[PDB]
Each structure stands twice: as structure tokens, then as C-alpha cells.
Design a protein around this ligand. Sequence first.
Ligand SMILES: [Ca+2]
Ligand SMILES: [Ca+2]
Ligand SMILES: [Ca+2]
Ligand SMILES: [K+]
Ligand code: NA
Length: 203
Amino acid sequence: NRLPYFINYFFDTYLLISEDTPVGSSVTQLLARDLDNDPLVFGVVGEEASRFFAVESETGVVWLRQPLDRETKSEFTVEFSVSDSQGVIKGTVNIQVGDVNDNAPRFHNQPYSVRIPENTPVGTPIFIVNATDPDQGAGGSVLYSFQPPSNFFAIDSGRGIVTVIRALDYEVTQAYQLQVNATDQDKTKPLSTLANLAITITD
Ligand SMILES: [Ca+2]
Ligand SMILES: [Ca+2]
Ligand SMILES: [Ca+2]
Ligand SMILES: [K+]
Ligand code: NA
């Protein structure tokens, strides 16, 4: 009797599963050969592995049994079994959880309030806004803007630095209420968040 062995590429590399994979989805089919042509039985081995995955024992089809979230657990290690009813073989698979853009930017250091004197020159940086996005790639990269755009202030798209771009006047306007939009850069479905910025003029 010779022991059966696993075929799939991912026993030697890794298996990618998207974090948006519906629970119940088949994520792969285990494949194995036996030089004796013995009928084969497949299994999943371990407590964490047996919560995440079920295996159809006669076909090797693997089902996801719990939702994934890359931002909570990005990778884990699982053991599958194959058996010819005389011996049992185990293979380890590294599971990588594939990222989707399922986070909108999150602001820190709120509320956002600044007092500036009315003599503040054009080009003066007055306040820094801060938003982060825990997604990977472009979906994790944030650009800042004013919604709607201001004639009196600008905000750096990259760094979130607010500047004065036209001279102020305490007489005309003693306060400004701005909306900072933070958008991620995903090509297909970008997500955005608005944050309040309060600017008070002194004299
Ligand atoms: Ca065999
Ligand atoms: Ca994500
Ligand atoms: Ca995002
Ligand atoms: K990021
Ligand atoms: Na997620």
C-alpha cells in the first residue's frame, strides 16, 4: 500500500480567499491521487480550521463556514487530511485573506476647531486634518478636499494641511463652517467620509 498525496498548487504556495466571499461559498476542491487507486476520504484538521471550513469527505469540496475580515485576521494556517482507509496524510495550507475596499476613511483628533487672526497672510498653513483607511492599495489611500470648495481656504490633497488663499475680514465674516471630504482612491467603488471644520476669526 502507498499513501495518497495532494495535487493542488496551494499546498506548496498559498490559497487566496477574498474577504467578500459569501459564507457557504465553495473556496476550492481538494484533489489527491493514490498509486493503488484506493477510494479517498478528505477532512479538515484543527479547531480554528474546523470553524472556518467544512470539507465534503468524498469529493474534497471546501466550504467557507464563517465570514472573513482582512482587517481583523489577514492570514491563517489550516491542515487538510486525505485517507485511503489504511493511512492518513495531512497537508498544511497558508490561507491569505484577499482585501476588498470595504472601509471608508476614519477621522482622528476631532472635533476640528481653529481660531486665526484676520491679518493671517495668504499662504499660511493654519490646521492639520487626519483621516486613515485600513484597506490595502489605492482603496487604502486618502485624498482630502473641501465640499463644496472654498474661496478663502484650500486643503492639501495628500497631507490635509489647511491654508488661507484669500485675505480675511473680521467685519464681513467672524466664522467659517467647512466640510472636509476624505476619499480613498479605489478605481471601481471609492468610499468617502465628511468631517466638520470650524474656523473662528479674531481681531
Ligand atoms: Ca493507497
Ligand atoms: Ca478591506
Ligand atoms: Ca477604503
Ligand atoms: K492606508
Ligand atoms: Na474588511
